[PDB]
Amino acid sequence: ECTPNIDGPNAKSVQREQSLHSFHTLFCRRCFKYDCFLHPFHATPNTYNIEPPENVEWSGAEASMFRVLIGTYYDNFCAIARLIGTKTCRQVYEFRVKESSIISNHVYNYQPCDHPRQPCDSSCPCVIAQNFCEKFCQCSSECQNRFPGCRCKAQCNTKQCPCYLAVRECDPDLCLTCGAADHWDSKNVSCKNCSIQRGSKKHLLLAPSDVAGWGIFIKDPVQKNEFISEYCGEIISQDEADRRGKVYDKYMCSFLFNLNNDFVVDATRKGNKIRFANHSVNPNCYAKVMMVNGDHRIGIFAKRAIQTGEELFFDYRYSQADALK
């Protein structure tokens, strides 16, 4: 179901909804981008007297314009006139009226408590799965399965913050005490559990190993439980990883990383520098999984303080059957 340009000649006047079929079915609120990669979504819209008239013609799809502007506007008087540059409030009033007259505790991934007939209940996916509800529930706002947000002055980084004590990050909209919310673009902050989202990764460096193949060295120093970078990659199924893991263990070269019982990360084909992290059992870094705006990302954190030039590692948490890599 398509309806061509409002800009161009073919201006087939259609219903308000039809003029936002695409925009309501493509866009991703979770992503804030149109057709996001990590946002697969195939769901149809469940639901969100005396004087004479003026003898001028309503252009095709100016119909559709003024039709969909009707709901959002809630009866605008002169605003709609400001927008559509060549229609009068009087003609607009007349047309509004005329057209009205013509009328095994495994880890899972997030989806909200999407429930019209109840708040987040026994039917809530996050309640059955022991997950927390994000800023996208179709429950009420007083859904107890929601998350409150922290109230620490500056440092949301120790057990004293719930957002750190719980395995997550300070979502800016739920945490204003900390400065997580503060800064549209600026990264000068004191909430030290807001780096992932902003992506304040370190200036890492690539050079040959002293263990196995390649390795990755940090330039400027760090301190313990400081953020280093994220271990990005493609995120795929488990069975897909079984398949790929066959050959990647035939190579004896993996880049796989268990996100949750539902999904896997693979940076074999694409990812970021950190995937050149070598292995040891006494590392100087380590890992965590973290839900962040309702997505499992992966954080890397310094197991100890480090100076310039060092090499980075971590516990892969294996049986050690595999050779050093």
């Binding site: 990647y248 263990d249 796989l256 990383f257 380590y286 992966i298 892969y316 948490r317």
Partner: peptide, 7 residues
């Protein structure tokens, strides 16, 4: 199951 890192 292939090699899969944990944290």
């Amino acid at each position: 199951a292939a090699a899969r890192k944990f944290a």
